[PDB]
Amino acid sequence: GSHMGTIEISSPSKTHILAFPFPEKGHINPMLHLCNRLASKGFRVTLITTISTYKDVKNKILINLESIPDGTDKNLGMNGYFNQFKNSVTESVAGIIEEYKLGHDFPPPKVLIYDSTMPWMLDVAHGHGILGASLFTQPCCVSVVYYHMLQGTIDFHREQSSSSKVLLLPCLPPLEDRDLPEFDYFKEDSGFVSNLLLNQFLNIDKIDYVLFNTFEMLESEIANWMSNKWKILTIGPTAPTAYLFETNTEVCMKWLDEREPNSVIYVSFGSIASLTEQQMEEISQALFTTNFNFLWVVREEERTKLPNCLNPSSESFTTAAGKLGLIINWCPQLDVLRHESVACFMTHCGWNSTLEAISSGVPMICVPQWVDQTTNAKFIQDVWKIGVRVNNNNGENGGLVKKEEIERCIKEVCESEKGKELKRNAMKWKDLSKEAVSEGGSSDTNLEYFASTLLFY
Ligand SMILES: C[C@]12CC[C@H](O)C[C@H]1CC[C@@H]1[C@@H]2CC[C@]2(C)[C@@H](C3=CC(=O)OC3)CC[C@]12O
Ligand SMILES: O=c1ccn([C@@H]2O[C@H](COP(=O)(O)OP(=O)(O)O)[C@@H](O)[C@H]2O)c(=O)[nH]1
């Protein structure tokens, strides 16, 4: 009694978060993990995705799901394709924000978490009166290389046949030419892919929340350098400690359950990369002669590039070394990596696979293909010391990696005493990533900072 007044409560359950990943699995997956964490804190979370990825996201998922049209003419070059994409999703998401601003079941949107490679989405959020959070899907270390490239002072031009160069940037180890992000692979479209990653920093000072899927201890020096400059929040890994529903889960878990512990080489080049027939044959011949079992993901659209001596969703093998192999179109990667049967991970070093391996304690054989995969491999081998990087036959990044070189790297990681060290290092980093996302860890604290401040008056 006695008093008279109204109390108003701002809590996660009446706070509405919008999330909009770039429509590729290396962008969708870290976003979905973050959304799962945010729903667990009680927030209302709506995931917006393009119609052509919608069924994939639906199969994987508390989370409200909205589709938007693709904006993909499929007939234009990369520049016109992306600009149509930008225009379509700009009006699409603006529309959704406004429906929800006038709705009554849901709270009005408080923030839009958008993919860092769609920086024009900050203009949509701010133009419609809500906060913007930019989710980077690459590590801090390679992201700052893009910032220095955008600043245009340092010369990143390279004529690698004339001389060799080493680049020193603040709070980064020296970077050889092969350590830089790889854009020449894209040939005529190299400038476009380049611009797309440089432009992540066009509005960096206007972003309300700068979110990186990494943990501070993994990237201490450069994260501090970026925290001083832009007040970033390292919130990773967004994947949980010991999930997304992936395909072939029961098949892969049953197969791995029937293998000896620490006996399986897990091989994946991610969702996008496509290897030449020659490269596939080098890998095949290594795997069929090594002293280990193997689980090798070859995507459906890549099966025809397999060697002549090998359509079918999966194939089982006894190898020429007496071991067992399984070739499959897709696997639950996080569950595979955390299986006791897995000895090591031959990976293209996409950032999600890298951080999922780190979070799982699995040493890597690095076969980087392009963009940040080269830089990631440099850190895996020489900084975190949890893998070895293959050497391309010719000196180049697009050069063939021979079976003998693959074999050499298997023997080092899996049979040598150096490999036992690499595995010790990987369990150390596994514990540190677990510590970062547990109560009082830097990533747990940073993600709570994001969540708590959303509630502020
Ligand atoms: C570099 C890029 C954008 C930045 C994000 O990190 C996602 C990657 C995926 C790979 C890359 C895109 C940029 C667009 C791409 C060139 C695009 C392609 C168009 C094409 O004809 O071949 C591939 C699909 C995806 C793509 O291959
Ligand atoms: O057989 C597979 C291969 C990949 N992935 C997942 O797909 C993502 C691949 O992203 P990454 O950044 O490693 O490389 P990209 O596909 O973008 O080249 C990661 O979340 C993997 O966990 C998977 O679930 N099953």
DSSP result, 317-381? EE-TTS-EEEEES---HHHHHT-TTEEEEEE---HHHHHHHHHHT--EEE---SBTHHHHHHIII
Task: Scan for tokens 């109560």, then name that residue.
Answer: 439
Q: Which amino acid is at 165?
A: K
One-character DSSP codes across 412-440: HHHTSHHHHHHHHHHHHHHHHHHHHTSTT
219 Cβ contact partners less than 8 Å away, ≥ 6 residues apart: 139, 140, 141, 234
Q: Which domains are seen in the chain, by residue range? A: 12-241+435-455 (3.40.50.2000), 249-434 (3.40.50.2000)
Distance of alpha carbon 421 from alpha carbon 407, whole angstroms: 19
CB 288, CB 318: distance < 8 Å:
no
Instruction: Provide the pairing of β-strand 342-347 with 314-318.
Output: unpaired
**How far, in Å, CA of 393 to CA of 289, rounded?**
20
Task: Report whether residue 193 contacts ligand 1, using a CB cutoff of 6 Å.
Answer: yes
- Tell me the residue type at 281: E
For residues 165 and 94, give the distance between their C-alpha atoms in angstroms, rounded to a whole number.
46
The three-state secondary structure class of 34 is helix
Q: How was this structure determined?
A: X-ray
Distance between CA atoms of residues 182 and 173, nearest Å: 18
273 lines ligand 2 (CB under 6 A): yes
Which residues are CB-neighbours of 250 under 8 A, at least 6 positions away?
Answer: none
Pairing mode, strands 342-347 and 364-366: parallel
**Is the bond preceding 237 in cis, omega lying within 30 degrees of 0?**
yes
Classify 103 as helix, strand or coil.
coil
Compute the residue count for the chain: 457
Quick check: CB of 273 below 6 Å from ligand 1?
no
**Hey, which residues does 68 pair with through a beta bridge?**
50
Q: What is the DSSP letter of 13?
A: G
Q: How far is the CA of 104 from the centre of ligand 2 (A)?
A: 37
* Angstrom distance (rounded) from CA 64 to CA 287: 43
Structure tokens at 293: 């079992």
- Residues with Cβ < 8 Å from 341, sequence gap 6 or more? 256, 257, 259, 260, 261, 262, 263, 264, 293
State how far the Cα of 217 lies from the Cα of 220, in Å rounded to an integer. 5
Instruction: With residue 35 as reference, give the H or E element that holds it.
Output: helix 25-40
Query: 279, 401 in Cβ contact below 8 A?
Result: yes
Query: Is 356 flagged in the annotation as binding?
Result: yes
Strand arrangement of the beta sheet that strand 63-68 belongs to: 63-68, 44-50, 16-20, 109-115, 131-136, 209-212, 233-234
CA separation for the pair 20, 113 (Å, rounded): 6
Can you say whether the dihedral through the CA atoms of 180, 183, 185, 187 is positive or negative?
A: negative
Cβ–Cβ under 8 Å, residues 345 and 337: yes
d(CA 457, CA 454): 9
Give the residue, by CA position, lying nearest to ligand 1 atom 14. 193
Quote helix, strand, coil % in the chain, to nearest 5. 45, 15, 40
Instruction: Using the structure block, give the residue that is written with the tokens 């133009």.
Output: 127
The sign of the torsion formed by the CA atoms of 294, 298, 304, 305 equals negative
Query: Ligand 2 pocket, 117 CB below 6 A?
Result: no
- CA pair distance 219, 141, nearest whole angstrom: 7
Separation of alpha carbons 374 and 393, rounded Å:
16
Residue identifier of the C-alpha nearest atom 4 of ligand 2? 270
User: Does residue 113 sit in helix, strand or coil?
Assistant: strand
Ligand 1 atom 11: the closest Cα is on which residue?
Answer: 193
Ligand 1 centroid to residue 189 C-alpha, Å: 10
Say which ligand is closest to the CA of 266: 2
CA-proximal residue: ligand 1, atom 2 (nearest): 193
As given in the structure block, the two tokens for residue 235 are 């919130």
Counting Cβ atoms within 10 Å, is residue 5 exposed (0-12), middle (13-18) or buried (19+)?
A: exposed
Determine contact, residues 381/389, Cβ cutoff 8 Å.
yes
Ligand 2 atom nearest 331 alpha carbon: 1
| CB-based contacts of 111-116 (< 8 A; 24+ apart in sequence) | 111/17, 111/18, 111/208, 111/209, 111/454, 112/18, 112/19, 112/20, 113/17, 113/18, 113/19, 113/20, 113/31, 113/34, 113/209, 113/211, 114/19, 114/20, 115/20, 115/21, 115/22, 115/27, 115/31, 116/200
Helices 190-198 and 78-102: crossing angle, nearest 10°?
A: 30
Rounded CA separation 141/179 (Å)? 11
* Closest CA relative to residue 267, chosen from 370, 322, 343, 321: 343
> Is residue 3 classed as helix, strand or coil in its secondary structure?
coil
Assess whether the C-beta atom of 371 lies below 6 angstroms from ligand 1: yes
Quote the CA–CA distance of 223 and 242 in Å, as a whole number: 26
CA distance 172 to 146: 13
Say whether 27 sits in a helix, a strand or coil. helix
Nearest CA to ligand 2 atom 17: 26
The resolution in Å comes to: 2.2
Q: 51-60 and 25-40 helices cross at what angle (nearest 10)?
A: 50
| Phi, psi of 63, deg, nearest 5 | -90, 125
Cα–Cα distance between 31 and 138 in angstroms, integer?
A: 12
- The three-class DSSP label of residue 199 is helix
| Burial (CB count within 10 angstroms: exposed 0-12, middle 13-18, buried 19+), residue 120 | middle
User: CA 195: distance to chain centroid?
Assistant: 19
